[PDB]
Assembly symmetry: none
Homo-oligomer: 23 residues x 18
């Protein structure tokens, strides 16, 4: 698994998920 | 598992999760 | 498991979790 | 398990958790 | 288990936990 | 278990815990 | 400006205003 | 500016205003 | 500016204003 | 500026204002 | 500036103002 | 500036102002 | 002999065996 | 012989065996 | 012989055996 | 012989055996 | 013979055997 | 013979056997 984020100026986000029964 | 974040100026976040029965 | 965060200027965060029955 | 945080200027945090029955 | 934090200027924190029945 | 903190200038903290029945 | 990201709402009943509102 | 990230609300009943509001 | 990150609210009843509010 | 990070609220009843408020 | 990090509130009833407030 | 870190409040009833307040 | 009379079940999720069983 | 009369169950989650059982 | 009369159960989570059982 | 009459259970979590049991 | 009449249980967590039991 | 009448239990946590038991 990998996530990464280069230089920005403003709002950013990552709600990435995995798995079952998240409900 | 890996996460990482380069230079920024402003709001950023990562709610990445994994696993079951999160409900 | 790994997390890491390079130079920034402002708000950042990581609510990354794993496991079951989080409810 | 590992966590780490390079030079910053401002607010940062990590609420990373693992385990079950967090409720 | 490991945690670590390099030079900063301002607010930082780590509420990382593990274990069950946290309630 | 390990925790550690390099040179800083300002507020930092670690509420890292482990174990059950924390309630 | 606002964000409403990443929510998981497992169950809701008889409720008002559970989401991002402004102005 | 605000964020509403990462919430898990397992159950809610008979409630008002459970999310990000402004101005 | 504010953040509402990482919350887990297991159960809530008959309540007002459980989330990030401003101005 | 404020943060509301990492909370776990297991159960709440008949309550007002359980989250980050400002101005 | 303030932080509201890491709280675990197991149970709450009939209460006011349990979280980070300012100005 | 203030912090509200690491609290565990097992049970609370009929209460006011249990968290970080300022100005 | 048994009876299962008069029930009102407002909401149910992810459940087993909510009704009259025997032998 | 048994009875299961008059119940009102407002909300239920992730549960086993909420009703009249015998032998 | 038993009775299970008149119950009001406002909310229930993650529970076993909340009702009339015998033999 | 037993009775389970008149109960009001406002909220319950993570519990076993909250009702009338016999033999 | 027994009775379980008139109870009001406002909140309960993580509990066993809160009701009328026999033989 | 026994009675369990009139109880008001405002809050209970992590408990065993709070009600009328016999034989």
């Amino acid at each position: 698994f990998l996530v990464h984020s280069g230089n920005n100026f403003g709002a950013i986000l990552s709600s990435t998920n995995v798995g079952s029964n998240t409900y």
